Amino acid sequence: GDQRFGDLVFRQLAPNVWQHTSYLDMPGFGAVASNGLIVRDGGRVLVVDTAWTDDQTAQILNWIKQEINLPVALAVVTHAHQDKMGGMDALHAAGIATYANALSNQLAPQEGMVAAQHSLTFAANGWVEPATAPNFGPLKVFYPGPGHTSDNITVGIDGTDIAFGGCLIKDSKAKSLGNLGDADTEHYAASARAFGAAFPKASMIVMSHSAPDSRAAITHTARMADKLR
Ligand SMILES: O=P(O)(O)Cc1cccc2cccnc12
Ligand SMILES: [Zn+2]
Ligand SMILES: [Zn+2]
């Protein structure tokens, strides 16, 4: 059930949940797909992650207008790399309230990103401080510890079997942990396992660079990360 919409791909995952996919021709790595989420919560839409670029992110909003036709109340982005935050200006131009881990917003300028408007902060156990995530509806935001990056955050969708690991989690057949340039290799395995423990009911694991998978994505990612230590 993939829907080609311009240069992007959209796939319904649940009655109120769709995955957005965008591509960037990155020299040395081919045309890399990146996934995020679109969630309808009653009369509004919530977005997880931008596309790689402003133009692609505007195209996500165009798809939302044509297929859902409800306002986008907010977006949350899951770390300060291009695939997750590269389209921040398009969200701001559209009047959408944007949220990121405080550390992502601090890192955004040096990473070439535009910061989100609002900062999420996290309790010692990883759960978002609820006052910093107002009106998130079914989105449950969890900081699992440093892994793919020090700022990576994850999102469960209450009322569904879906949890989103972003670039922390790779699929159950993945050959590597991908881009470790900003990774915490010592803590990766525990962070991947903490994501699994935060969302024990999630049987569909969504991630940045592979199609949705079973929880074997979590166990396999953690087992690969065991080897980094
Ligand atoms: O780490 P990601 O997935 O957020 C962004 C990304 C994806 C693929 C290859 C990369 C190479 C260098 C830097 N970033 C890359
Ligand atoms: Zn990244
Ligand atoms: Zn990635």
Ligand 1 pocket check for 181: Cβ under 6 Å: yes
Q: How far is residue 32's CA from residue 194's CA, in Å, rounded to a whole number?
A: 27
Residue 38 near residue 49 (C-beta atoms within 8 A) = no
Burial class (CB in 10 A: 0-12, 13-18, 19+), 175: exposed
- The boundaries of the domain holding residue 169 are 2-228
From the CA of 108, how far away is ligand 3's center (Å)? 16
Write out the two tokens for 211: 């199609």
CA triplet 116, 217, 224: central angle to 5 degrees?
Answer: 95
Atom of ligand 1 nearest to the CA of 148: 1
Write out the two tokens for 77: 């982005």
DSSP 213: B
Task: Choose the residue to mutate in 21, 22, 26, 78 for probing ligand 1, maximizing ligand atoms within 8 Å of C-beta.
Answer: 26
Q: How far is residue 54's CA from residue 216's CA, in Å, rounded to a whole number?
A: 33
Number of domains, the chain: 1
DSSP letters, 91-132, are HHHTT-EEEEEHHHHHHTGGGTPPPPSEEE-B-TTSBBPGGG
From the CA of 49, how far away is ligand 2's center (Å)? 11
Residue whose structure tokens are 């900003």? 182
Helix (H) or strand (E) holding 62: helix 54-67
From the CA of 179, how far away is ligand 2's center (Å)? 7
Ligand 1 pocket check for 33: Cβ under 6 Å: no
Burial class (CB in 10 A: 0-12, 13-18, 19+), 11: middle
Ligand 1 pocket check for 180: Cβ under 6 Å: no
Helix (H) or strand (E) holding 77: strand 72-77
Q: Which residues contact 107 (CB under 8 A, 6 or more apart)?
A: 80, 113, 151
From the CA of 179, how far away is ligand 1's center (Å)? 5
CATH number at residue 90: 3.60.15.10
Write out the two tokens for 226: 């065991």
Q: Which amino acid is at 131?
A: A
Tell me how the structure was determined: X-ray
Residue nearest to atom 14 of ligand 1 (CA): 179
DSSP 134: T
